[PDB]
Amino acid sequence: GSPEKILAQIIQEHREGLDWQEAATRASLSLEETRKLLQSMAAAGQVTLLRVENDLYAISTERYQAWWQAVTRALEEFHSRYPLRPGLAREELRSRYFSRLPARVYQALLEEWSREGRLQLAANTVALAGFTPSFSETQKKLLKDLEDKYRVSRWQPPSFKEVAGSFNLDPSELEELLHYLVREGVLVKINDEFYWHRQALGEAREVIKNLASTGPFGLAEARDALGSSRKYVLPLLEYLDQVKFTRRVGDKRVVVGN
Ligand SMILES: [Y+2]
Ligand SMILES: [Y+2]
DSSP: OOHHHHHHHHHHTOTTOEEHHHHHHHHTOOHHHHHHHHHHHHHTTSEEEEEETTEEEEEEHHHHHHHHHHHHHHHHHHHHHOTTSSOEEHHHHHHHHOTTSOHHHHHHHHHHHHHTTSEEEETTEEEETTOOOOOOHHHHHHHHHHHHHHHHHTTSOOBHHHHHHHTTOOHHHHHHHHHHHHHTTSEEESSSSBEEEHHHHHHHHHHHHHHHTTSOBOHHHHHHHHTOOHHHHHHHHHHHHHTTSEEEETTEEEEOOO
16 A cells, blocks of 8 residues: 555564564665654554654554553552652663563663653663652651651661661661661761761751851861761761862862852
8 A cells, every 4th residue: 555554563563573674674764764654653653653763663652652551550569569669670670571672672662751740860770750758657667767767866867777686676677767768868878887867967067157257167066066976977078069169279278158
């Protein structure tokens, strides 16, 4: 039949879809003409075109929709089982549910769904865009007690090991809870050993603004204004240097952020 018909049949004869070249060759159409037909069929809603770099990959819209379904099932499961984690490792999601797809297509697929506002792509993890943690009452209490320990500690936060012992948790478990609290903005990571209650960090910065208001300051001066040991204050200052709140000028620091 006509090129449109021939091409449509070819696309249907490929469950996992096929790329631009394959389609053109099989339809005996030029690359240029194949693109034009693929582009129009896409605008018609009959086909879905994944833009894999400067290459094109065609799949039946029915199949594209089924793929989205495999993702929600995969994420629904991961999210319910690991409420504290941000998402499923990109690779795990790929090998477990999209092993039949070329890696490049899988990537373009995550991109499109991300651009449509369906997924949250952070680091190398994939999460449903509207992912809402569902904790058990025991998990909720631990998050509460955990946040309170840091809140009460103010500018003398307990170390990772200390908290680990107190609540008697394994390193793996505590890191997961703390990282979740960091994402919710309850805590801020100063370094691998120290996390600070966000509100406490805000007050500490105000202390630092007041300290700096009369001239550059050294570690010893920050130590006294915060009434906290250098053990907690140096890591704080290096963290503040990093987010550009403070700035080292010589052997002292000035405040260069709000
Ligand atoms: Y892209
Ligand atoms: Y110096």
